[PDB]
């Protein structure tokens, strides 16, 4: 725009109002999710399928990275131990 108590109460009011309306929008989204899950028990199943596939892909990538590190350290250890 173009002492302490004023800014204090002002931030109290605006922040509490923002928090209430954010929690209300979250409640609306949760209601929509509940309705769609209870009355359309097929899009939630598709969501579970996608989530499980993503989890499997993430696990595969992690195990690949672990195998790469393991092979690197195996070569490093095979280099040493020598005389």
Partner 1 sequence: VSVNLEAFSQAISAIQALRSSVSRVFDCLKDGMRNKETLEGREKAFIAHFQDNLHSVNRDLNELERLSNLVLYSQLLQAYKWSNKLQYHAGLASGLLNQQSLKRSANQLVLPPQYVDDVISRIDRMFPEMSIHLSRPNGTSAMLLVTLGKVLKVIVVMRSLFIDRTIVKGYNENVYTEDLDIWSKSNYQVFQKVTDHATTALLHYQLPQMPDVVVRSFMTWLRSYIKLFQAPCQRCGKFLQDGLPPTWRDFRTLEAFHDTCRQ
Partner 2 sequence: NTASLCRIGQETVQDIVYRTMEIFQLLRNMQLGTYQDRLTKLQDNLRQLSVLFRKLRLVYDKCNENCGGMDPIPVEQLIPYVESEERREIAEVNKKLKQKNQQLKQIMDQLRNLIWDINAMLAMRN
Partner 3 sequence: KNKLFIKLTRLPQYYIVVEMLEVPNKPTQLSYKYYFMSVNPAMALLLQQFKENMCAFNKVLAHFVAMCDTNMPFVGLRLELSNLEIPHQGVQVEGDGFSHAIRLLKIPPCKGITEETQKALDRSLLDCTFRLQGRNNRTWVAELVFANCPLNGTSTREQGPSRHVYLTYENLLSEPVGGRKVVEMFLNDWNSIARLYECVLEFARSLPDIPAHLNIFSEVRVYNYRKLILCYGTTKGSSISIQWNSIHQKFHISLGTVGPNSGCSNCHNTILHQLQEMFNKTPNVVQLLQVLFDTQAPLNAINKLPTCFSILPQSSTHIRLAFRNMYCIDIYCRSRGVVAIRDGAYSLFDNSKLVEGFYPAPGLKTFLNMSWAASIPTILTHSALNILLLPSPTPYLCSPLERFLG
- Contact positions vs partner 1 (CB under 8 A): 4, 7-8, 11-12, 15-16, 19, 22-23, 26
Closest C-alpha to 33, from 43, 24, 23: 43
The alpha carbon of residue 3 and the mean position of all alpha carbons in its chain are separated, in whole angstroms, by: 41
Cβ proximity to partner 1: between 26 and 48 the closer is: 26
Q: At closest approach, how far in Å is the CB of 36 from partner 3?
A: 25
What is each CA distance from 6 to 9, 10, 25, 68, in whole angstroms?
Answer: 6, 6, 29, 60
Sites of contact with partner 2 (CB under 8 A): 18-19, 22, 25-26, 29-40, 42-50, 52-53, 55-56, 59, 63
């Amino acid at each position: 725009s173009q002492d302490q108590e004023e800014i204090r109460t002002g931030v109290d009011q605006c922040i509490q109002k923002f928090l209430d309306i954010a929690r209300q929008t979250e409640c609306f989204f949760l209601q929509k999710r509940l309705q769609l899950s209870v009355q359309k028990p097929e899009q939630v199943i598709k969501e579970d399928v996608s989530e499980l596939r993503n989890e499997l892909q993430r696990k595969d990538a992690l195990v690949q990275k672990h195998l790469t590190k393991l092979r690197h350290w195996q070569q490093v250890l095979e280099d040493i131990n020598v005389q």
